[PDB]
T-cell receptor
Framework: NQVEQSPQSLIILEGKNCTLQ??????????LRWYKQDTGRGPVSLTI?????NTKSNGRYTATLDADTKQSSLHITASQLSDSASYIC?????????????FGRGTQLTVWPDIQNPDPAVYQLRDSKSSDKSVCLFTDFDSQTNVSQSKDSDVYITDKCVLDMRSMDFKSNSAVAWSNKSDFACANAFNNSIIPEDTFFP | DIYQTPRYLVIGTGKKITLECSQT?????MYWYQQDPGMELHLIHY???????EKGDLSSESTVSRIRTEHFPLTLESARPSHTSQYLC??????????????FGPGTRLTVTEDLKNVFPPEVAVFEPSEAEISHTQKATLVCLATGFYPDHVELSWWVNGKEVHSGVCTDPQPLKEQPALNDSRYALSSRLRVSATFWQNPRNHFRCQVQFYGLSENDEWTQDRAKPVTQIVSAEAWGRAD
């Protein structure tokens, strides 16, 4: 590709800044853009810059260009959850109807919450017997805890998810495991994962 | 704005397909992109105006037509698994500054499958908060489970007292494959709704997990003697529990 992006992917906590990189070999050069693409949606144009402009801002998004060295950076200030998305560098060779657009492969960005007071626990959730299942919920662990998918087509483990209780100023991570088979209990549902030592098992 | 239909399409192999794209901003240049989930945007066709038709850096089993400035339909030929992915329509108009801004449609997520007999709607279950969580945290987490569905054409939403909520909700970004060794594996998806303990303890509060499933149409031929896996809503509910 004539447009390469760096890094391939990164994971950051909310509150922090980060910088994505675009390098190109497109010649001639007319303008450079940064798109944001949310999962399942179409890209949104964040910023356009011409060869003679250094820098362009859109909210907490600030793009930088050095046409001399064929390099642009997108800097994100005070990252929040919704920043989680794929960011695409696109370069155009000519500034008019006849120009072609060149898309980088994009950088995947994930933004996890900053959990100051973790309270890891594995709860069992009832109701149903609608489902011949048993649902376990691993919750309130901090963002460094990694949730590993288990290798039983009986035992299903989702990856981790951030939920935001806006009116309480409270955020939490959670992962859901379940299995119809009887040989299953929340005590060992998350065995394949490294849960914190102090995890509350009721 | 710019529009795309259908949003979701499941189709058996070898069948003709047309993806509609409309734009009412009066834009001249229009584009079609193909994107595999997690991958780059490959340009496949474009148009300069009224009667322009060109090919992109990827040649496929596809054609487009620009009869009018508004409509830019795409045609996919003898349906082949490969088509499975997202097709994005876009147009660029002179936003200002001498520059053209690109605007994208919502897209079509296409799945192409060997046999339609492999299409199944999801099952939905809701699970109430554990007493342990309630007492330990004064919070209460409902979990919703959608399982047994093919293809991955699903939209999960939570309704409390008949109004849709987004606060306190997290849905898996990606679904799970029931059996990850099979081409047409069915899927499962999970979501959490978290509320205060006192909210949960009010037995007047009503909770609904709703899953919109996109499948076959009533027009589509069905020979399978089971219920046609048509586009439908599958749902599950719980009520607050005084305890």
């Amino acid at each position: 590709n004539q447009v390469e992006q760096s890094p391939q992917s990164l994971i950051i906590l909310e509150g922090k800044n980060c910088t994505l990189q675009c390098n190109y070999t497109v010649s001639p050069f007319s303008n450079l853009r940064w798109y944001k693409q949310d999962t399942g949606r179409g890209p949104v144009s964040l910023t356009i810059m011409t060869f003679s402009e250094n820098t362009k801002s859109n909210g907490r998004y600030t793009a930088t260009l050095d046409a001399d060295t064929k390099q642009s950076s997108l800097h994100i200030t005070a990252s929040q959850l919704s920043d989680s998305a794929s960011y695409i560098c696109v370069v155009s060779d000519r500034g008019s109807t006849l120009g072609r657009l060149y898309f980088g492969r994009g950088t995947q960005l994930t933004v996890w919450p900053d959990i100051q007071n973790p309270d890891p626990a594995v709860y069992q959730l009832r109701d149903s017997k609608s489902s011949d299942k048993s649902v376990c919920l691993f919750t309130d662990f901090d963002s460094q805890t990694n949730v590993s998918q288990s290798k039983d087509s009986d035992v299903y483990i989702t990856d981790k998810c951030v939920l935001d209780m806006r009116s309480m100023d409270f955020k939490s991570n959670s992962a859901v495991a379940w299995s119809n088979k009887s040989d299953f209990a929340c005590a060992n549902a998350f065995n394949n994962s490294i849960i914190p030592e102090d995890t509350f098992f009721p | 704005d710019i529009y795309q239909t259908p949003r979701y399409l499941v189709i058996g192999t070898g069948k003709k397909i047309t993806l509609e794209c409309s734009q009412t901003m009066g834009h001249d240049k229009m584009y079609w992109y193909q994107q595999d989930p997690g991958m780059e945007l490959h340009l496949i066709h474009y148009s300069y105006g009224v009667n322009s038709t060109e090919k992109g850096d990827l040649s496929s089993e596809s054609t487009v037509s620009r009869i009018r400035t508004e409509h830019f339909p795409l045609t996919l030929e003898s349906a082949r698994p490969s088509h499975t992915s997202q097709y994005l329509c876009a147009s660029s108009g002179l936003r200002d500054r001498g520059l053209y801004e690109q605007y994208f449609g919502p897209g079509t997520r296409l799945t192409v499958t060997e046999d339609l007999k492999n299409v199944f709607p999801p099952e939905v279950a809701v699970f109430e908060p554990s007493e342990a969580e309630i007492s330990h945290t004064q919070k209460a987490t409902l979990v919703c489970l959608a399982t047994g569905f093919y293809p991955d054409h699903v939209e999960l939403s939570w309704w409390v007292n008949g109004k849709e909520v987004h606060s306190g909700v997290c849905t898996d970004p990606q679904p799970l494959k029931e059996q990850p060794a099979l081409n047409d594996s069915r899927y499962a998806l999970s979501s959490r709704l978290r509320v205060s303990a006192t909210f949960w303890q009010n037995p007047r509060n009503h909770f609904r997990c709703q899953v919109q499933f996109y499948g076959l149409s009533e027009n589509d031929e069905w020979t399978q003697d089971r219920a046609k896996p048509v586009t439908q809503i599958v749902s599950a509910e719980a009520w607050g529990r005084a305890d």
